[PDB]
Structure formats: C-alpha cells, structure tokens
Ligand binder design. Structure first.
Ligand SMILES: *[C@@H]1O[C@H](CO)[C@@H](O[C@@H]2O[C@H](CO)[C@@H](O[C@@H]3O[C@H](CO[C@H]4O[C@H](CO[C@H]5O[C@H](CO)[C@@H](O)[C@H](O)[C@@H]5O)[C@@H](O)[C@H](O[C@H]5O[C@H](CO)[C@@H](O)[C@H](O)[C@@H]5O[C@H]5O[C@H](CO)[C@@H](O)[C@H](O)[C@@H]5O)[C@@H]4O)[C@@H](O)[C@H](O[C@H]4O[C@H](CO)[C@@H](O)[C@H](O)[C@@H]4O[C@H]4O[C@H](CO)[C@@H](O)[C@H](O)[C@@H]4O[C@H]4O[C@H](CO)[C@@H](O)[C@H](O)[C@@H]4O)[C@@H]3O)[C@H](O)[C@H]2NC(C)=O)[C@H](O)[C@H]1NC(C)=O
Lengths: 101, 58
C-alpha cells in the first residue's frame, strides 16, 4: 500500500485543482449537525457543530490495485489538493485537534 | 550509549505512519484507560463540563 501512496504522490502538484483546463471541479457536500449551540441575540450569532464532508474526483489519484479504497487519517490531507471551502457568514470557526486532527 | 542510539535510529527505517498496524491483516485493538485527576467545574450556562484526565491508549 505504501507503493500505491508513493506512486500517487509522485509527480503530483497540489497547487493545481483537478481538471484545471477542462471543466469546473464538481464537489458534493454533506453535513451532519451534532448540535446547534446557543443563539446569542446580543451578538446576533449562533454556534453550530458539524461533520462537513466533501466528495470530488481527481484523476491524478487513480490507482489500479486489489485494495479498491485507501482509508487514511489527516496525514495526507496536506499532500493533495483540497477545496478552498469557507463559511461566508462565520464570525469565528475552529477545527478540532484533540487528540489528533 | 551506542546500542541505545543505534536502536533508536534504526527503529523507523522503512516505517509508514500513514498506515495503521496490521493493515489488511487484522483489526487494530486499542486498550483505553482514563484517570480523572480532577472532575472540573460543570457550567450550567453552557451545558458544558471540564475534566482533567490522564488518557492512556495501548
Ligand atoms: C502571525 O503569527 C501567528 C503565530 O505564528 C500565526 O498563527 C499560526 O498560523 C499557522 C497557520 O498559518 C498555524 O499553523 C498550523 O497549525 C496546524 C495545527 O494546528 C495548530 O493549531 C491548533 C489549534 O490552534 C488554533 O486554534 C484556534 C482555531 O481552532 C485559533 O486560536 C487559531 O486558528 C489557532 O491556530 C493547535 O491545537 C495545534 O497544536 C499542535 O498540534 C498540531 C497537530 O497537527 C501540530 O501541527 C502543532 O505543531 C502543535 O503541536 C505541538 O503542540 C501540541 C499542543 O498544542 C503538542 O501536543 C504537540 O506535541 C506539539 O508540541 C497547532 O498549534 C498545523 O498542523 C500546521 O502544520 C500543518 O500544516 C502546515 C500547512 O499545511 C504544514 O506545513 C505542516 O507540516 C503541518 O502539516 C502536516 O499535518 C497535516 C495534518 O495536521 C497534514 O495534512 C500535512 O500533510 C502534514 O503532515 C505531513 O507532513 C508533515 C511534514 O510536513 C509530516 O510530519 C507528517 O507526518 C505528514 O507526512 C500549522 O502549524 C499556527 O498554529 C498558528 N500559530 C498560533 C496560533 O500560535 C499567524 O498565521 C500569523 N499571521 C500572519 C497573517 O502572518
């Protein structure tokens, strides 16, 4: 499996999105809301905790093997292109880093 | 000493932390233990509570 990951990362440019010169990158988004926190009417804001998932296609990361799926923690998240998704109306947003990312 | 240094240096040669132990062979079993040093204050205004823990995983 290490060979597969090394081959995928070999000759990979994470600065460029997939289909950079072909078509828009289609991303399918999912949300699971754990809790909509208290609504601060004084500040006009509300806290919300979510599991945010994004699915897209990157033909650069194609691999032919019997594994059929590589399940990985955050370690390679910085090694590939990730969407630039941000929340437009978020006064403050934080990711979680305990125990690990 | 020399034996200690060579053991430490050569331990991770050819090691991939991206993969869990026993990937494709078995299920990784983790034994968990918690020692609550101090059950922190419970915040009614937040539905929140703090707890200081020594968290052990084997
Ligand atoms: C002005 O100046 C300030 C101060 O300098 C500056 O603020 C700083 O901004 C930078 C971003 O620009 C920020 O750096 C990143 O932090 C990432 C981790 O989280 C850190 O923050 C969390 C939470 O802090 C935030 O909390 C609030 C929001 O939630 C809010 O206050 C802020 O946003 C705040 O930042 C914190 O919990 C973390 O604590 C630790 O745990 C991290 C675990 O990943 C670890 O990286 C940290 O070093 C740190 O670990 C030590 O401390 C803990 C205890 O706190 C101990 O338990 C540990 O043992 C350590 O002693 C962090 O503080 C951090 O992950 C970023 O580094 C990752 O990403 C960058 C960018 O991609 C990479 O270059 C890094 O290599 C690294 O990427 C690896 O890991 C990710 C997964 O996390 C993988 O996806 C990557 O592929 C990669 O892993 C692969 O490669 C590496 C080698 O590259 C390899 O080792 C791996 O095995 C693997 O192969 C980055 O450091 C910084 O924290 C922040 N400083 C502050 C706030 O003090 C401003 O930006 C400046 N402003 C301007 C405009 O200039």
């Amino acid at each position: 499996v290490t060979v597969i990951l090394n081959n995928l990362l070999e000759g990979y440019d994470n600065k460029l999105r997939p289909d950079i010169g072909v078509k828009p990158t289609l991303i399918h988004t999912d949300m699971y809301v754990n809790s909509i926190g208290p609504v601060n009417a004084i500040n006009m804001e509300y806290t919300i905790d979510i599991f945010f998932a994004q699915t897209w296609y990157d033909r650069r990361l194609k691999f032919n093997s019997t594994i059929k799926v590589l399940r990985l923690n955050s370690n390679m998240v910085g090694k590939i292109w990730i969407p630039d998704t941000f929340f437009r109306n978020s006064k403050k947003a934080d990711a979680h880093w305990i125990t690990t990312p | 000493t020399t034996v200690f240094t060579r053991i430490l240096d050569r331990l991770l040669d050819g090691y991939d932390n991206r993969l869990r132990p026993g990937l494709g062979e078995r299920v990784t079993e983790v034994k968990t233990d918690i020692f609550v040093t101090s059950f922190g204050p419970v915040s009614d205004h937040d539905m929140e509570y703090t707890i200081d823990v020594f968290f052990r995983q084997s």
